[PDB]
């Protein structure tokens, strides 16, 4: 369930847009605009349980909160590290916020403008593109089509059960 939430300086989600088709049906009829990203993701995960896209209690479910620093922010590269650091803390807050839901274990991945441009074209979230990218380095036996339907939890084991060795 890949969704991209564009946030303002005040941490409020300006627009909720789908990265993948699964996220599109999930966000159908969701008013989550002008609200803080922390509550936005919390309601979003819970609605993924309601629609039944993902299993709440059955599997060790990894929920991915990935965030990238925007292209316009990256106009200059002066202390872009600082913005990334604050972004990492922003994501760390989202992580601690949404982990309060039943059997939700969260991974947070900070990404650059590259992962986001590619992720929206490949039809995934930034972090699911990022671990796919790394999984093609660690193996290369993972296709982009399967990534649309698979779990990010299953992607972690794709990366760890790496078979670029024969």
């Amino acid at each position: 369930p890949s969704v991209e939430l564009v946030i303002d300086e005040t941490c409020r989600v300006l627009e909720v847009r789908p990265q993948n088709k699964d996220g599109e049906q999930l966000i159908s009829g969701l008013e989550l605009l002008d609200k803080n990203v922390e509550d936005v993701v919390y309601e979003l995960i819970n609605r993924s349980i309601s629609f039944g896209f993902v299993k709440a209690d059955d599997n060790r479910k990894i929920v991915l909160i990935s965030g990238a620093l925007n292209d316009k922010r990256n106009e200059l590269k002066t202390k872009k590290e600082n913005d990334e650091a604050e972004l990492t803390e922003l994501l760390d807050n989202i992580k601690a916020r949404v982990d309060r839901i039943d059997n939700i274990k969260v991974r947070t991945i900070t990404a650059t403008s590259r992962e986001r441009k590619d992720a929206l074209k490949y039809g995934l979230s930034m972090g699911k593109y990022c671990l796919y990218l790394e999984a093609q380095e660690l193996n290369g036996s993972i296709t982009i089509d399967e990534v649309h339907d698979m779990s990010i939890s299953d992607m972690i084991e794709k990366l760890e059960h790496h078979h670029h060795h024969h």
């Binding site: 996220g23 965030g67 922010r73 930034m126």
Partner: peptide
Amino acid sequence: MYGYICVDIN
């Protein structure tokens, strides 16, 4: 303009 958060719920 701060950033974009791509979530993937499993």
